[PDB]
Structure 1
Amino acid sequence: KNIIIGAMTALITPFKNGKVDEQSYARLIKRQIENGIDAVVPVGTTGESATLTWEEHRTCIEIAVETCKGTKVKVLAGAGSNATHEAVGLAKFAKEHGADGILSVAPYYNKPTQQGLYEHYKAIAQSVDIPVLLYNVPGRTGCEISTDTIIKLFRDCENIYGVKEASGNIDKCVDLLAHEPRMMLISGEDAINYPILSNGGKGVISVTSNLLPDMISALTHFALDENYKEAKKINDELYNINKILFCESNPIPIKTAMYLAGLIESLEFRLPLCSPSKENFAKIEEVMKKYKIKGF
């Protein structure tokens, strides 16, 4: 299978006066490239995909594709929906905009059955010829892609090559790779990046890497090179910031941190997301001081 693995960043989407700051978006991706990142994920959850128009989806994907051109950094585009017909269309659009692959979130809110999840992703995989990474995050979607469903999709569909897991369930990570060791298990939960990698996961899709791309890329590359002592050391150092970046729902804390670091010009969200509380604003700022933040 064609795969997209390694250290990846779920990119924030900076806003300035209610519009996507396209220059800031390009500068942030170039910053990721210069700090060892292997792929970027535009318009995912951390990028506020729910509140972006389709034209803004296309713009962000195009900026990512063309900023990464000629650098070997891949673009794993967020392209998913809780309506299969729409998810198929988003997969095709992402392929047309130049993405190297897609990250396709499990259907949220309508709680499909395992059979429904299988038919959903099978329709997506058959619509394109680029890699498809499943995304399991039951705390947000209200459903879970079971291990049996993930493994069936991996084996039955050429393009489906693994799964991003954000489920706080290292037992499931053992379950997946013990029964199907050929799949690419990707960490979607920064605080446990090292445990997932040390069990044979092959990458991360990171929130923290928006702020500390060098540290997350180093962590991942230490781990893939089987230097677990050094990968764990970074994972341990990062725990405090990895936890504070979820003191409110992602991406509220990470955008706050990027703003505090001078990496984006304005702390702007689209409703229903909004600024954190003043208490959590102060907590984020104090935790950041312990970390060396790369500039541009």
Structure 2
Amino acid sequence: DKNIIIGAMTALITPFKNGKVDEQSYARLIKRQIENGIDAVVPVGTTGESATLTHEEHRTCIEIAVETCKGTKVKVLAGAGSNATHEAVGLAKFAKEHGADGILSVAPYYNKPTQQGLYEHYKAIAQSVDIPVLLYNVPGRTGCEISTDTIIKLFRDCENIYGVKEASGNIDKCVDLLAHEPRMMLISGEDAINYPILSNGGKGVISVTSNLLPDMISALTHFALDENYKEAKKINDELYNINKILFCESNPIPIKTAMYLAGLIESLEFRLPLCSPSKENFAKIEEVMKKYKIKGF
């Protein structure tokens, strides 16, 4: 096989305090993920508000995850994608330099490359580092889809591309992927359907919910990897309400709202154009939260 990063993973939120990244809170939150069975953390993905961080903050966030995971079996899969290939290569190289175990690389958003463009984009990225690269498909945000054929070609042509995070609400595609190329690591990027993706041979999750409920997401994932499907589904069913409410408005608006209500971050603060949820949605999130046992620090 190739070198891989799988298991229960968390797309880390990035707490702000008075506009500034709260780096002490960020380290604390990672330790909390670590203590609750999480296998890897994903600094500066979509959930971490990658769009609104400076390059230096981006790098710092990776550094913090790296430093915090040292001395543990937990890995850092650093968010490093861009819709400009030169920037994506740069971010990938930095991530490798700061000691990341691998990178998560979102499909170019907004500029809608063709399948050929996506292929050359990821081929260029994979060639720039000797560390694992997980592709990330999320057409609702990007405006483009990495097709199954392109994913499979990338996996077969590039040594370090080992799988894809799918956030596309398409279980047919998930079947297509693993039926034609069962060696790849399919990763769930959609919490509500973690179980179905794992039960089809998916080997991990990159989760939003796990920011709030890491013990539950890790237990779910580990049961499925142990083929204890009954237990995995049970947790998946249990988590459905919170998994959905965490998307009542665009992620990470609801998850930051939950983390704040839980006393886990200090300030319900975003960077524009993101902002507080509506009062209605704030109330729904707080209400759904009452059904769950939330781990403290």
User: Which whole-Å deviations, capped at 9, do the CAs of 1:136-179 have from their partners, x for residues lacking one?
Assistant: 00000000000000000000000000000000000000000000
Question: Equivalents in 1 of 2:126, 2:106: separation in Å?
Answer: 13
**Residue 192 of structure 1: how far off its partner (Å):** 0.1
SS state of the match for residue 126, structure 1? helix
Question: Equivalents in 2 of 1:31, 1:236: separation in Å?
Answer: 24
* 2:157 match: 156
- C-alpha root-mean-square deviation of aligned residues, in Å? 0.3
TM-score (norm 2): 0.99
Moved over 4 A (4+): none
What runs of 5+ residues in structure 2 fail to find an aligned partner?
Answer: none
Count of residue correspondences = 296
**Residue 258 of structure 1: how far off its partner (Å):** 0.1
**Residue 270 of structure 1: how far off its partner (Å):** 0.1
SS state of the match for residue 164, structure 1? strand
SS state of the match for residue 71, structure 1? coil
SS state of the match for residue 128, structure 2? coil
User: Which whole-Å deviations, capped at 9, do the CAs of 1:33-72 have from their partners, x for residues lacking one?
Assistant: 0000000000000000000000000111000000000111
SS state of the match for residue 237, structure 1? helix
User: Which whole-Å deviations, capped at 9, do the CAs of 1:184-222 have from their partners, x for residues lacking one?
Assistant: 000000000000000000000000000000000000000
User: Which whole-Å deviations, capped at 9, do the CAs of 1:115-140 have from their partners, x for residues lacking one?
Assistant: 00000000000000000000000000
* 1:259 match: 260
User: Which whole-Å deviations, capped at 9, do the CAs of 1:213-252 have from their partners, x for residues lacking one?
Assistant: 0000000000000000000000000000000000000000
Question: Equivalents in 2 of 1:217, 1:61: separation in Å?
Answer: 22
SS state of the match for residue 87, structure 1? helix
TM-score (norm 1): 1.00
**Residue 2 of structure 1: how far off its partner (Å):** 0.4
* 1:234 match: 235
**Residue 25 of structure 1: how far off its partner (Å):** 0.2
SS state of the match for residue 93, structure 2? helix
Question: Equivalents in 2 of 1:232, 1:17: separation in Å?
Answer: 41
SS state of the match for residue 134, structure 2? strand
What percentage of aligned pairs have identical amino acids?
A: 100
User: Which whole-Å deviations, capped at 9, do the CAs of 1:240-274 have from their partners, x for residues lacking one?
Assistant: 00000000000000000000000000000000000
Question: Equivalents in 2 of 1:166, 1:11: separation in Å?
Answer: 16
SS state of the match for residue 242, structure 1? helix
What runs of 5+ residues in structure 1 fail to find an aligned partner?
Answer: none
**Residue 180 of structure 1: how far off its partner (Å):** 0.1
Question: Equivalents in 2 of 1:134, 1:128: separation in Å?
Answer: 14
Question: Equivalents in 1 of 2:296, 2:85: separation in Å?
Answer: 40
* 2:223 match: 222
